[PDB]
Amino acid sequence: SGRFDQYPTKKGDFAIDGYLLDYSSPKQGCWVDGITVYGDIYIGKQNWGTYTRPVFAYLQYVETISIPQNVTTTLSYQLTKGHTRSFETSVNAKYSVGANIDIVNVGSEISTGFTRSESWSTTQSFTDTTEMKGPGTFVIYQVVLVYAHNATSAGRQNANAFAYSKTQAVGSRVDLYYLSAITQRKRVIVPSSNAVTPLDWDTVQRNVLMENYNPGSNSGHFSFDWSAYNDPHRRY
């Protein structure tokens, strides 16, 4: 809970990957300093002009591997592309994002490792391989990128669509504040003795959005940059 104020803030892949992808001392998560972007996001029955910014990055659990002997072997495990399996089930309305949103990552100095279209579409499993020698038990984690969204005017129609959401009335209009997660072609294999307890999507949502963000004051552990609406370099 209050552990979220103890997580550091990182900017760009070098800082994020360097922090999270440590096999001797793995880290649960970190806040992300990123640029704000404006463009359409399809929620429910139409598109909405949405403000998107990276806010957090965490290690998602993949699998536990057991090698009982001093034998060199090849490991086959399943990673995912696009939105996380946890996010996909957390939304009940029709949800679609245009690949051009990836300007957010370019700007915030992040590269998913997947193609623009692969990165922001439906969850897709894929096989990855690693040469491993035992004896030992190992834990595989995959990097997840969390984004905070302000789907303008969506709050009246799609408040109940997301498991964790916040509405904010701006005149006759009702803004929708929610969180989304995508995967990165980045994984860390840690010996079980050094393994850290992974954070899950409900914890991340409860702490990042519900506990550390106030839509009314646009403040908390992070804030949106509404100047994206007037920057052509930050519009898609």
């Binding site: 029955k45 139409q46 303008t152 129609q157 701006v170 209009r173 949106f224």
Partner: peptide, 8 residues
Amino acid sequence: PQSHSIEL
């Protein structure tokens, strides 16, 4: 926050 969005 500025916007162009409306319910249709």
